[PDB]
Coordinates of C-alpha atoms in Angstrom, one line a residue:
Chain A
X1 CA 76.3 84.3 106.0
X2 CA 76.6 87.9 107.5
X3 CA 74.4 91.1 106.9
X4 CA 76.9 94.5 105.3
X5 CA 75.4 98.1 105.9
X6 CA 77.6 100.8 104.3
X7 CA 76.5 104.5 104.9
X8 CA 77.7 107.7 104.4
X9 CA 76.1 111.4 105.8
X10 CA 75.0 111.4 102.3
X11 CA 73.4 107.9 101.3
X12 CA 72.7 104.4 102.4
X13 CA 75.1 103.0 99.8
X14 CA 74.7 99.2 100.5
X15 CA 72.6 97.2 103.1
X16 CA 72.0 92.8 102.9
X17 CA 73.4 89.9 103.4
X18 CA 76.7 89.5 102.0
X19 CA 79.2 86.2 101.5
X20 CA 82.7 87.7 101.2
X21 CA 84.2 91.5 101.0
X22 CA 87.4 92.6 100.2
X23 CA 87.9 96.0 102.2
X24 CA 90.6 98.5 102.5
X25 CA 92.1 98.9 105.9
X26 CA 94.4 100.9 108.0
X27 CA 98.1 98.9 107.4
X28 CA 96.6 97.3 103.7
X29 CA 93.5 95.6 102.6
X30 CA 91.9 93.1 104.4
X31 CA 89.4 90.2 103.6
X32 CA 86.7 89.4 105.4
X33 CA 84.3 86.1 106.1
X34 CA 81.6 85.1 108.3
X35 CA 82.9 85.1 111.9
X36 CA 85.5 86.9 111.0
X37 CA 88.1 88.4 113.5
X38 CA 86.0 90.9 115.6
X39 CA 87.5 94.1 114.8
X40 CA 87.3 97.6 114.5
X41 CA 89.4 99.9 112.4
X42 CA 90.1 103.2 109.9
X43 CA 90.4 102.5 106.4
X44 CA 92.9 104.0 103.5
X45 CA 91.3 106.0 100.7
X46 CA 90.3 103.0 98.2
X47 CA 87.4 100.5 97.6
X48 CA 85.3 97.6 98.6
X49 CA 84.6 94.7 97.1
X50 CA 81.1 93.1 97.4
X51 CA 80.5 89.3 96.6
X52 CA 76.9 88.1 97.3
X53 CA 74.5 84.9 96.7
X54 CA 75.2 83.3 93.7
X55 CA 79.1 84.8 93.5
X56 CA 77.7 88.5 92.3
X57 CA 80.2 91.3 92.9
X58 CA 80.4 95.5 93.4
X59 CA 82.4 97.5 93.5
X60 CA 81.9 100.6 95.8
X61 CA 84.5 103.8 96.1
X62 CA 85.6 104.3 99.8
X63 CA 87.0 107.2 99.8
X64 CA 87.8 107.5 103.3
X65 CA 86.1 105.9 106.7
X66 CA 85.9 103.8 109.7
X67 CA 84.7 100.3 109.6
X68 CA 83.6 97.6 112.4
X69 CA 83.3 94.1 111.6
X70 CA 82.8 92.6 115.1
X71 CA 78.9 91.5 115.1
X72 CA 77.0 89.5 112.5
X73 CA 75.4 92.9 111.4
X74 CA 78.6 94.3 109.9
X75 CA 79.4 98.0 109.2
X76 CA 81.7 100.1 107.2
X77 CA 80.9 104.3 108.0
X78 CA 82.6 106.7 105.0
X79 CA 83.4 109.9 105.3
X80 CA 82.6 109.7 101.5
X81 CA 81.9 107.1 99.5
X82 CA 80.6 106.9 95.5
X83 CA 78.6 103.8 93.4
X84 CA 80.8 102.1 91.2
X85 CA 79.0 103.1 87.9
X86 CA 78.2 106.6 89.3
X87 CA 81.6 107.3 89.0
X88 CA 83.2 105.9 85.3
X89 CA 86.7 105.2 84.0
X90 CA 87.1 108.3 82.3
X91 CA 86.3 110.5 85.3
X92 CA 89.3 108.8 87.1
X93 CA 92.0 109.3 84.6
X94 CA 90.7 113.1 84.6
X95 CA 91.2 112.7 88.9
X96 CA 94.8 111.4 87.1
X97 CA 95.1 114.9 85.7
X98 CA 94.4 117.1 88.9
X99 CA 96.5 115.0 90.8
X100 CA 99.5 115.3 88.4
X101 CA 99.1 118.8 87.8
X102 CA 99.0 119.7 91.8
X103 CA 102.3 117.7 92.4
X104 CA 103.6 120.1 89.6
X105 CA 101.9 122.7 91.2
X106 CA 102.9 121.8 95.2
X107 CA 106.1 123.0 96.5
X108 CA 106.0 123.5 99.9
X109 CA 105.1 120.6 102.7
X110 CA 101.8 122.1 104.0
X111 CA 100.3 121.9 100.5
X112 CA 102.1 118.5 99.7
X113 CA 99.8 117.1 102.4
X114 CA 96.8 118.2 100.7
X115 CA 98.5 117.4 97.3
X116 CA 99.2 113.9 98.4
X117 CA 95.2 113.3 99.4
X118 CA 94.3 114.9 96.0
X119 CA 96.6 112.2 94.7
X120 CA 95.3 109.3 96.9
X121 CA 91.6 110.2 96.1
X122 CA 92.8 109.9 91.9
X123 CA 94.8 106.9 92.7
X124 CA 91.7 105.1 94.5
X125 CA 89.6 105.7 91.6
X126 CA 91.8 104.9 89.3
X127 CA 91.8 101.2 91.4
X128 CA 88.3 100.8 91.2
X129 CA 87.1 102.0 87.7
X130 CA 89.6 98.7 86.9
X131 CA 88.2 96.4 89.0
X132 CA 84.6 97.6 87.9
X133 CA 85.2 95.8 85.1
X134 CA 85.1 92.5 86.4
Chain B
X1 CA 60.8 114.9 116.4
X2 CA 58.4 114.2 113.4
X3 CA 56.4 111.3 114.1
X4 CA 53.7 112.4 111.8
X5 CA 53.3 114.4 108.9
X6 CA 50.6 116.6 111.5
X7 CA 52.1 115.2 114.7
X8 CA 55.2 116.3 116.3
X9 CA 56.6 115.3 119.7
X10 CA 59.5 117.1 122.0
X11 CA 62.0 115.1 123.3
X12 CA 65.6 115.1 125.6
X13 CA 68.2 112.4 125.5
X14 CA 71.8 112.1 126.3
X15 CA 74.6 111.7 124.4
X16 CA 77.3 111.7 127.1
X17 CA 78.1 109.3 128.8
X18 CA 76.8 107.5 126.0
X19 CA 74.7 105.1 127.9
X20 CA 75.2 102.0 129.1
X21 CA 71.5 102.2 129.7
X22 CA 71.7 100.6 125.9
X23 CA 71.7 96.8 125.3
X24 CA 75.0 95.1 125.6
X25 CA 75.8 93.0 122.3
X26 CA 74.9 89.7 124.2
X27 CA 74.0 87.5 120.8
X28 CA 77.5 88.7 119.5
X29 CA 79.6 87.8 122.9
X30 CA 81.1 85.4 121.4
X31 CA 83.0 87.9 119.2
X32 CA 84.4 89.8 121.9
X33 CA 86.3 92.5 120.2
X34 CA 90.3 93.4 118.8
X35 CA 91.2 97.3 118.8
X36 CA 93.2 97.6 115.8
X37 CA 96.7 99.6 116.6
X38 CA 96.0 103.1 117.6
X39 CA 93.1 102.4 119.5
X40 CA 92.6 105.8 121.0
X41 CA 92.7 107.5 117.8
X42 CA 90.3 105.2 116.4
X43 CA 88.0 105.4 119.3
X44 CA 87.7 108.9 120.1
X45 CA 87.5 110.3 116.3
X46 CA 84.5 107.2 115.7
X47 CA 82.7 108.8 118.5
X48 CA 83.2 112.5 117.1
X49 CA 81.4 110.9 114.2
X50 CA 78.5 109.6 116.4
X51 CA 77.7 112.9 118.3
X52 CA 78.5 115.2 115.1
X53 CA 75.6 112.6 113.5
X54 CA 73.2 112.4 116.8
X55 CA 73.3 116.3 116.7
X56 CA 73.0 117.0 112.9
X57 CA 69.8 114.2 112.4
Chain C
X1 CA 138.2 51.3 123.4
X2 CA 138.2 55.0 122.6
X3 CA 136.0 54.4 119.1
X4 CA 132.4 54.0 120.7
X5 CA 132.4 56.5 123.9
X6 CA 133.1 59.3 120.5
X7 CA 130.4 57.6 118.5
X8 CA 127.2 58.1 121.5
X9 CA 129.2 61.7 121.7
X10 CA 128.6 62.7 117.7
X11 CA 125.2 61.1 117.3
X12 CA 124.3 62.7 120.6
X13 CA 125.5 66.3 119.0
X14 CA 123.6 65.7 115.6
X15 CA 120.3 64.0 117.9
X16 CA 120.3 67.1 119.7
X17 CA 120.7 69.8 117.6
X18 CA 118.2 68.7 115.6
X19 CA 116.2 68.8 118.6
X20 CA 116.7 72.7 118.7
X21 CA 116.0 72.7 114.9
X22 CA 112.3 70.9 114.9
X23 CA 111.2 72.5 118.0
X24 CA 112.1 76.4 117.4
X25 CA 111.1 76.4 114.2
X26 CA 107.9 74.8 114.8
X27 CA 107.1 76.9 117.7
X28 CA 107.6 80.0 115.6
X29 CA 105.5 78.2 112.8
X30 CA 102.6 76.9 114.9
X31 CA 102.2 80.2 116.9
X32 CA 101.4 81.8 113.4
X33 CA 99.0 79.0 112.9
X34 CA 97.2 79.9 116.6
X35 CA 97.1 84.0 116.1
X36 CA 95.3 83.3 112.5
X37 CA 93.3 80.1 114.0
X38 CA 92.0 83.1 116.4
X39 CA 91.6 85.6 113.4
X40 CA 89.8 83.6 111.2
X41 CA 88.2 80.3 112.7
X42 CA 85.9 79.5 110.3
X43 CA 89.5 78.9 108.0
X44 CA 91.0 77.0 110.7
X45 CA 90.6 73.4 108.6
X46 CA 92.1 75.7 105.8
X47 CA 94.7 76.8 107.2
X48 CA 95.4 73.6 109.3
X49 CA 96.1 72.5 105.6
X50 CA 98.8 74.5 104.9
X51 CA 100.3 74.5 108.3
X52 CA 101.3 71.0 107.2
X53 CA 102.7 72.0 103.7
X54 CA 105.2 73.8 105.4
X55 CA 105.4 71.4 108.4
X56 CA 106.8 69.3 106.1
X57 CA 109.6 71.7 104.8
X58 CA 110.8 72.4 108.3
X59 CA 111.0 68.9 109.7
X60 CA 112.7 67.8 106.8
X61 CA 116.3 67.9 107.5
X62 CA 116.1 67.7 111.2
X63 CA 114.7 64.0 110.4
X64 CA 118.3 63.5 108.0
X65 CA 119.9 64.3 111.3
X66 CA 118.0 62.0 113.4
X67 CA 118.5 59.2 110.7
X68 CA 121.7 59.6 110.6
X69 CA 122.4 60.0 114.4
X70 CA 120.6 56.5 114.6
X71 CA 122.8 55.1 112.5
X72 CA 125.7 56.5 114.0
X73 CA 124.7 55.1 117.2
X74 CA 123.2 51.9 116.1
X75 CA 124.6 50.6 112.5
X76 CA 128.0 51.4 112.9
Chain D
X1 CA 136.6 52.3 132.2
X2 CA 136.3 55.7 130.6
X3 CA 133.4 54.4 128.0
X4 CA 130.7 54.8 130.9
X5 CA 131.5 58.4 132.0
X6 CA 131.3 59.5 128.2
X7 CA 128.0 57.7 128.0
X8 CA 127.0 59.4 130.9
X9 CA 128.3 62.6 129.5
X10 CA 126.2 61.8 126.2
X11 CA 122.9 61.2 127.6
X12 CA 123.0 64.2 129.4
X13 CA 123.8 66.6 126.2
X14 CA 121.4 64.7 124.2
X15 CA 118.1 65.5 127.1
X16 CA 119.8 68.5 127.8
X17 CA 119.5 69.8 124.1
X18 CA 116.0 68.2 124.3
X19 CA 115.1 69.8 127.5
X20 CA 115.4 73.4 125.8
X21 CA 113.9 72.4 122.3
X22 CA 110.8 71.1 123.3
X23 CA 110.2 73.7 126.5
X24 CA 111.0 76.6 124.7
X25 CA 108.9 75.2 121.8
X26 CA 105.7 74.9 123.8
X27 CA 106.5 78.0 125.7
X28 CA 106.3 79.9 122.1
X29 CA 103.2 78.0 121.1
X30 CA 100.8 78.1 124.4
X31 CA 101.9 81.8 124.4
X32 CA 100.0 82.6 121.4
X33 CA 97.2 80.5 122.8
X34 CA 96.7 82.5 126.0
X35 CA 96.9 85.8 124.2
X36 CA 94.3 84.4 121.5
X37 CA 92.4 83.1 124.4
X38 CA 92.8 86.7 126.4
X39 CA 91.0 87.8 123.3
X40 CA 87.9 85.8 123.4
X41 CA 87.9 83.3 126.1
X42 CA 84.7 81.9 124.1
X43 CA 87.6 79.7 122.0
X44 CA 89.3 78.4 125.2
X45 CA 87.4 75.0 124.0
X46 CA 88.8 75.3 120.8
X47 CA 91.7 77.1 120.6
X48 CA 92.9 74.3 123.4
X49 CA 92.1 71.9 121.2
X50 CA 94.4 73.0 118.4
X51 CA 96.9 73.8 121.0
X52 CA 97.0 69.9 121.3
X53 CA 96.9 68.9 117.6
X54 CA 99.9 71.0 117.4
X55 CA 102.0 70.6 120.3
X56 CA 101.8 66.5 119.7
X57 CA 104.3 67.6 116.9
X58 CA 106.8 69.9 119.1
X59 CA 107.2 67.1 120.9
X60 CA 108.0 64.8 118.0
X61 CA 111.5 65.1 117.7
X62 CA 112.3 65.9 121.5
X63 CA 111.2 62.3 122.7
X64 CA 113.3 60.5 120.7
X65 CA 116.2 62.4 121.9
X66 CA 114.7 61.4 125.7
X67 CA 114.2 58.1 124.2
X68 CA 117.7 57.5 123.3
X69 CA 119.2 59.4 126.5
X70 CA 117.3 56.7 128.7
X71 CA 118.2 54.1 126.5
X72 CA 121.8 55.1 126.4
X73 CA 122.2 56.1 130.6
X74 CA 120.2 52.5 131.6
X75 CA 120.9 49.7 128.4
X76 CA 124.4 50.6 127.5
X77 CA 125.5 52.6 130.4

C-alpha cells in the first residue's frame, strides 16, 4: 500500500505503512487510498483515522496542520497533535467546559476569534474520544 | 553538527532559494501534483514551517 | 393528406428533445465521473459502477420518448 | 405536394436537435478530460480510454435521431 509519517515539533506521532486514512481537510474531511489524488493541503482542527494490515485502526488528535499526500511516502505536519489514549474522554468534556464558559465569557469579536478556536479545539476532542472507541 | 558524542563538525547550507540542487521526485512523477484552493497561502505559510524547523533543529 | 406530414413533425419534436435530454444530462453526469476517475484511479472500476446506477435513471425517460416517437412515426 | 417540404422540414429539426445534444455533450465531457489530463498527462492513456467508454453513450441517443433524419430526408422524402 502506501507508507504515513505524521510529526509534530514535539513527537514523531506515527510512521509505516498504512492501507486507508480518514483525514480532516481544509473544505471537510477527506479519505484517502493508495494513489490517491496527489495533493497538498491545510487541515481543520479534528482527527485522523488510521487503518492498517489486518483492518487495525487509531485514532490520532490533529489539532491543527498541513498535510501532503502527493508521493507514496505520505505526510501529514501538525502544528499540535495528541495520541488517542493520551488524551481520554473525560478530559474532552472538561475542554466542553472551557469552551462553554469563554463563549459566556466572550463579548467582543477579537476575543470571539480566540473563543471560537478554544471551542474548535473542545469540539475536536470531543469527535475523537467517540471514535476512540471503536 | 553532532556527529559524535566526541566529534563535532561545522557546517553552512542554504535555505533560500531552497535548492533545486535537491532530487526531483522522479519515482513519484507520475503523481504530478493538485494545489488545493488558496494555493499561495498554503504554500508560503508550509515553507515558514520548513525554515522556522531548518533553523530551530 | 395533411395527417402524416404532422405525424414526422411530433415524433421529430419528442425524437429530438430527447436528444437534448440524454446528452446534457449525461455530459454533466460523465464529467463528474472523469474529475473523480482523475482523483481517485485506483476507484475508477468502482465508481464506473455507479456511474451506471445512475446512467440508468437519466436515460430512462428519454428512451419513453424515443419509443414513443418511433411509434408515432412508424405504427401509426 | 406539401408532405415533402414538411418532411424536409422534419429531418432537419430532428438532426438539428441532435446536432446540439450530442456536440454540446462531448464538448462537456472531453472538457473534464483535458483539464484531468492538464493535471497529470501520465493518464492521457487512460483517462482517454474512459473518455471513450463514456462518450459511446452520449452518442447513444443522438444517432438514432440522425438515423431517422436520413431515413426520413432519403426513404420517405
Amino acid at each position: 500500500t502506501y507508507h504515513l509519517d505524521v510529526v509534530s515539533a514535539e513527537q514523531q506521532m506515527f510512521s509505516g505503512l498504512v492501507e486507508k486514512i480518514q483525514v480532516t481537510g481544509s473544505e471537510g474531511e477527506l479519505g484517502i487510498y493508495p494513489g490517491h489524488a496527489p495533493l497538498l493541503t491545510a487541515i481543520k482542527p479534528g482527527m485522523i483515522r488510521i487503518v492498517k494490515q489486518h483492518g487495525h485502526e487509531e485514532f490520532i488528535y490533529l489539532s491543527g496542520g498541513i498535510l501532503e499526500v502527493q508521493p507514496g511516502n505520505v505526510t501529514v505536519l501538525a502544528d499540535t497533535a495528541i495520541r488517542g489514549q493520551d488524551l481520554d474522554e473525560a478530559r474532552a468534556m472538561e475542554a466542553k467546559r472551557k469552551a462553554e464558559e469563554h463563549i459566556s465569557s466572550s463579548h467582543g469579536d477579537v476575543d470571539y476569534a480566540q473563543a471560537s478556536a478554544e471551542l474548535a479545539k473542545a469540539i475536536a476532542q470531543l469527535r475523537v474520544i467517540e471514535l476512540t472507541k471503536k | 553538527k553532532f556527529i559524535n558524542t566526541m566529534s563535532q563538525v561545522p557546517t553552512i547550507s542554504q535555505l533560500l532559494p531552497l535548492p533545486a540542487s535537491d532530487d526531483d521526485d522522479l519515482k513519484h512523477k507520475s503523481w504530478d501534483y493538485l494545489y488545493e484552493p488558496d494555493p499561495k497561502a498554503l504554500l508560503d505559510t508550509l515553507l515558514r514551517r520548513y525554515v522556522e524547523s531548518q533553523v530551530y533543529q | 393528406n395533411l395527417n402524416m406530414d404532422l405525424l414526422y413533425m411530433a415524433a421529430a419534436v419528442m425524437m429530438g428533445l430527447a436528444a437534448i435530454g440524454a446528452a446534457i444530462g449525461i455530459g454533466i453526469l460523465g464529467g463528474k465521473f472523469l474529475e473523480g476517475a482523475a482523483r481517485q484511479p485506483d476507484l475508477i472500476p468502482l465508481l464506473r459502477t455507479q456511474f451506471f446506477i445512475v446512467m440508468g435513471l437519466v436515460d430512462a425517460i428519454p428512451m419513453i420518448a424515443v419509443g414513443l416517437g418511433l411509434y408515432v412515426m412508424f405504427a401509426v
